[PDB]
């Protein structure tokens, strides 16, 4: 057996996974989205396939700054896609902040979404174009394209160049979104490098 395993692809049961963080620690289980629309909020429903409720997640190493920020998440953010493009809507009373390398390519730019705004955060056509442009740049170049399939968002507090908090590990409440569809296409290119 000098050949490798035949690679097969099955459609993901979830179009994205979301991991919640407080400062630099994972908090709670990873949320998986089986529906085209979902909301990440600060409430306490643990059994809604369309709601990732952060208010019920406990953290015994949590300080008062994180505790106060959690109370301001409120209605949180609505995440849903149309076609090959993903977007985020701020339902909360406080703003939300987004770091999307796929959006920066069009590299740490953090964008505010004021309460009530509807903003786009991903375009799969521009990712495929970049993925096509990256195959010429080597294996390690394409391998680091995972950053384009992941989107980080912070509630209430911002971070980056325009803020005292330099990194996302300094924000009290943030999430990391993984786009499973594009990750599969990236997987097929990586296996062919």
């Amino acid at each position: 057996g000098p050949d490798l395993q035949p690679v097969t692809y099955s459609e993901p049961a979830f179009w994205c996974s979301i991991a919640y963080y407080e400062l630099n620690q994972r908090v709670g289980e990873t949320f998986h989205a089986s529906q085209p629309s979902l909301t990440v909020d600060g409430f306490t429903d643990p059994s809604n396939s369309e709601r990732f409720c952060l208010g019920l997640l406990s953290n015994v190493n949590r300080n008062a700054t994180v505790e106060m920020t959690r109370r301001h998440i409120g209605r949180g953010v609505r995440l849903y896609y149309i076609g090959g493009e993903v977007f985020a809507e701020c339902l909360s009373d406080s703003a939300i902040f987004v770091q999307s390398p796929n959006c920066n390519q069009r590299p740490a730019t953090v964008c505010k979404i004021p309460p009530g705004c509807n903003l786009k955060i991903f375009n799969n056509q521009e990712f495929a174009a970049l993925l096509a442009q990256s195959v010429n740049q080597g294996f390690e170049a394409v391998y680091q394209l995972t950053r384009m399939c992941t989107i980080r968002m912070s509630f209430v507090k911002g971070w980056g160049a325009e803020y005292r908090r330099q990194t996302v590990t300094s924000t009290p409440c943030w999430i990391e979104l993984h786009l499973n569809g594009p990750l599969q296409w990236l997987d097929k290119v990586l296996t062919q490098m």
């Binding site: 459609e11 076609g83 195959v135 599969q184």
Partner: peptide
């Protein structure tokens, strides 16, 4: 080769879907 095929499939599917290569 087969890499250019995958790039062309993705270029096509990227226009209207987040679906994978299945």
């Amino acid at each position: 080769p087969g890499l250019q095929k995958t790039l062309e499939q993705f270029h096509l599917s990227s226009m209207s879907s987040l679906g994978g290569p299945a």
